[PDB]
């Protein structure tokens, strides 16, 4: 086509989606990770994760307001990944890398799994 | 912080949100523009437009499944702007610029209004 493109548009959309999440506006699901609860938008979770994409395209699960993750999933690792989904920034540290990689593998977030693998390989 | 950033993340999220819109997945509102209807996600509309941000933060309107726009709004201009919201690409042409600018002013999409003004000024 002959379209023009606004370079910062995608980043501005994601920033506003994160502002709606912080103010709990139009969040339609609570993700339960052991004792911890995280509110989010189903559409953003699906856009970022192969696991959520599969869950919310399922004809019964698409209607659930609560999703319980596997008990092996670490709440801090989930929190770091949820923050990444809404910001593009990943808080990857020596103390959390193993939990972040395991959660990214479970959530099917291939770009996160890739950088965790590279950061681990460099430390070996 | 000491975060790492994935450059293409925001663009990849927006691409997936557009794929969900095309397949009518988790769309929660229909925007009526005279005889035409457009399905979308309330969160994306709010993230892109000052008008939708005001509508869907209103305690009564946030629950509506149908929103009727002002009868002066051109359906093609709306369609072009809805496509821009979900892709960052604006199909701006001599034949549609006036309708696109008027719709962007109504929707409160300041970056679109700005480029329409500049494209018009250059043609004068």
């Amino acid at each position: 086509d002959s379209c023009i493109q606004f370079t910062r548009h995608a980043s501005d959309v994601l920033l506003n989606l994160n502002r709606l999440r912080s103010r709990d506006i139009l969040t339609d699901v609570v993700i339960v990770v052991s004792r911890e609860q995280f509110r989010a938008h189903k559409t953003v979770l699906m856009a970022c994760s192969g696991l959520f994409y599969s869950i919310f395209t399922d004809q019964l699960k698409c209607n659930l307001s609560v999703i319980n993750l596997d008990p092996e999933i670490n709440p801090e690792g989930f929190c770091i990944l949820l923050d990444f989904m809404y910001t593009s920034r990943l808080n990857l540290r020596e103390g959390n890398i193993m939990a972040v990689m395991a959660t990214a593998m479970y959530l099917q977030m291939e770009h996160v799994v890739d950088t965790c693998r590279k950061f681990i390989k460099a430390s070996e | 912080d000491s975060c790492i950033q994935f450059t293409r993340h925001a663009s990849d999220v927006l691409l997936n949100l557009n794929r969900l819109r095309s397949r009518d997945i988790l769309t929660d509102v229909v925007i009526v523009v005279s005889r035409e209807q457009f399905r979308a996600h309330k969160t994306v509309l709010m993230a892109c437009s000052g008008l939708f941000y005001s509508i869907f933060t209103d305690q009564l309107k946030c629950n509506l499944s149908v929103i009727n726009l002002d009868p002066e709004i051109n359906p093609e201009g709306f369609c072009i702007l809805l496509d821009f919201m979900y892709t960052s690409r604006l199909n701006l042409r001599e034949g549609n610029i006036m309708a696109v600018m008027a719709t962007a002013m109504y929707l409160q999409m300041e970056h679109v209004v700005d480029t329409c003004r500049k494209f018009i000024k250059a043609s004068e």
Binding site: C3, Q5, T7 | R89, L90, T115
Partner: peptide, 4 residues
Amino acid sequence: WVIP
């Protein structure tokens, strides 16, 4: 704005 750019030409994509």
